[model samples]
Target: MFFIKDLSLNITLHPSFFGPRMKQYLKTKLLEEVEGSCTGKFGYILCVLDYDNIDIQFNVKYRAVVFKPFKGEVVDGTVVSCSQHGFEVQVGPMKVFVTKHLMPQDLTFNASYQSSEDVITIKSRIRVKIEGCISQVSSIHAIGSIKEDYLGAI
Candidate 1:
């Protein structure tokens, strides 16, 4: 599986510009779509002018075409943001939140440890897996557990 953040423009050209006859051209190349917001002057293309080495950015000619970035698997992520709803995880492409009960026992709330200060800090490069999708016109993801022995360690 490909990590979302690992994609680069030099990796592969967007396939939408071409028809299915040349679909095979993206066998192993990395590709991402370009996005943008409209301005009175002209539609501007969106790009990751700056990435923290862990954020995914895609490029395309349309700049603001309505399309989904290819879904990518999250092999790793961290706890960059959180809230009462659940914890937001940073995997490959972007961050996703898990509902309060979405976590496994170890990470879930236990009556024995309901202290308000109970917090979890996922150190850099923690192992996390996820599935990418587009939901409600936003980049969406579903988090998976770190069951393997080496998946996640406090």
Candidate 2:
């Protein structure tokens, strides 16, 4: 990663788009943005991947840390990825996990590959309500269910 002190931005080069690649991209992007500078506060930021002068956008929100289950807060998030465990909802440097059961009833997954349901999968413009506060830096777990009012997949 290359750091630009004047612009307060860190840039990295990554391979072509894929599952693991996107996950790495999101994690690295968050690390570059909220690397221990902002604390105990929740805020949002945009993760933009520049490709040949084009920009692919992502949204993230940072929430205050939580020590116990159900002690955290909910913030607006975007579903940038899907894995066997669950989907990765970006909340600043903090990402909340929503397991298969916690996912909206409509979504499906394949046990063989541990991927999302072919029809309803995480993608670029999906809005999700992140449940659970920060259990650790840039890490979170599922605490609440994603219902329409409590949590919504948009």
Candidate 3:
């Protein structure tokens, strides 16, 4: 599931830029504000900047995950992207890549069937097995696999 969460920040316009009377930079700066702020409870948050109702210390809302992960655990993810020897599963904002060699034996990469034109951002779902996880910086990075009993593979 998806959850809406709020966050706050204090912003001050620098003296030189104050008189320019443009709020574009403030808007852009806000989106870039907490890009890497991770928590054990919420996993990580992206696009947490919402509605331009700014007044220095303002409240903003965005979508978040009530999650974190471990090496032996599994997660269901959506949004597919293909790469050389790899295909990344977008989990919220993080990409969990499953290498070609790591794919289920039946998933052969034949041309025309899974090439550029076949790629879609249509939000198809996939269940993934995680090998490990790392926090911060890139929000969180995971080593993924297509594995295990009862957790059906797509």
Candidate 4:
């Protein structure tokens, strides 16, 4: 479900970061800017794999790092919430949604509990196949399924 893609970022240096630990500082900033962030096409950027190249121009650092996750990828995550409409899951920093129709045929809504908090326990973990993705610059929502064999709860 993850991939390494080459991406370049423009790194600007502050006056205080001009000395011995500049390289280290730049690396830290790179992670802060890219890791755990979401892009419209890329579901989520897990982290920087490695630096491909680094160039300096007017104190700005230009570098590329291989980054993941596209549509139609299977992922594992915990069920965060459930309802008659569907369920939501926490997959890393992204939340995936599975409609009732996407769930296994045998699994039906169990709204036996009265309390909202007690309705769906957070302990359930499952495997899901990503069907589609809708993302903005900073947020992403995933469409997933668990109807097929070997794809439901663990």
Candidate 5:
């Protein structure tokens, strides 16, 4: 599931950006700062839906915009690391942990495929259902499961 969240940030403009298209410049800066970013409580910001309001004071702009994704959401990501215990998957801006118990009943850990210290190069495309959060901040530290019928590697 996704949510349109109105979030605010301050954008300071350089003298070169102070011109007729200053508001547009402010909007551009806002997108650059917020889009593709992540917050633990909100998950990843896929894109900026729109702006609610923009206030300019002393060449600095304060604006609110939208963010995306929520908890209990299903997403596809690549398995970035693996161990006997679990897999570390990068889904959007969050690195989710999928423990062995959360995997399919038949799937077992394959250690021979591991080529480096932390990199897991297995049949890497994985479908995970976000279970819950362990922490919520600039990034999300969450648990995921692939125990369902249609979940796991593609």
Candidate 6:
């Protein structure tokens, strides 16, 4: 599974920039150092963050997301993220991804986030077909598809 992170930079500031303008200077410097850049580890720093307050979900439905990579089934998921190459979907327990190439022919990609222009946007409810699955050292995973006529959002 692919993930996006925005934790603290944990940077220690130099007194040279201290004073009223230090915050912005620090923030701006942080951006210049990493934002829009790529690292083999965390990925594009295209997007940071805080203490708890994360969530509460329907019991055990969250457990379903861990049911291995069962291929050849349809699952309804919520759009959690969008990217140039593909996007990620949330299906209760775990997340699945659908890339541009495996999508239906009528859709198009947006530079900011992939969208159908026919109107699929981030957070849209969608249905997908689990076509291919594989096992990696990390875990077992699968590729999702939206290529069929019946596979779009509700």
Candidate that scores best on TM-score: 4
lDDT of 5 by residue, 1-154 (tens): 4555556677766787778988877877877877777776665667665355555453434433333344577888888888888888887556778887787655666771222222235448877888877545776577889877677765
Residue 126 in candidate 3, Cα distance off native in Å: 1.0
lDDT of prediction 1: 0.41
lDDT of 1 at 138: 33
lDDT, each prediction? 0.41, 0.45, 0.57, 0.68, 0.67, 0.58
* Native-referenced Cα lDDT, model 4: 0.68
Query: By lDDT, highest first, what's the ranking?
Result: 4, 5, 6, 3, 2, 1
- Per-model TM-score, in order, reads 0.39, 0.39, 0.50, 0.68, 0.61, 0.50
Give lDDT: candidate 5, residue 21. 88
Better of 1 and 2 by lDDT: 2
RMSD of 5: 6.2
Tell me how candidate 2 scores on lDDT.
0.45
Write the residue-wise lDDT of candidate 1 on 44-153 in tens digits.
Answer: 23333332232223332111222122333335567775555555666544465545554545565442112343345544345544433434433334554443455443
lDDT of 6 by residue, 1-154 (tens): 2244423444467676668865555555555654444443333344322212212121110010113446777888887777777777776445678887877666767652334454556788888887776655444455788888788675
Model 3 score (lDDT): 0.57
Model 1: how far residue 54 lies from native, Å: 27
Q: Pick the lDDT winner.
A: 4
Q: Which stretches of candidate 4 lie over 4 Å from their true place?
A: 14-21, 49-67, 112-121
Task: Note the residue pairs that clash in candidate 3.
Answer: none
Worst 10 residues of 4 by lDDT: 112-121
> Which regions of candidate 5 deviate over 4 angstroms?
1-4, 10-21, 49-71, 112-123
For model 5, which pairs clash? none
Between candidates 5 and 6, the TM-score winner: 5
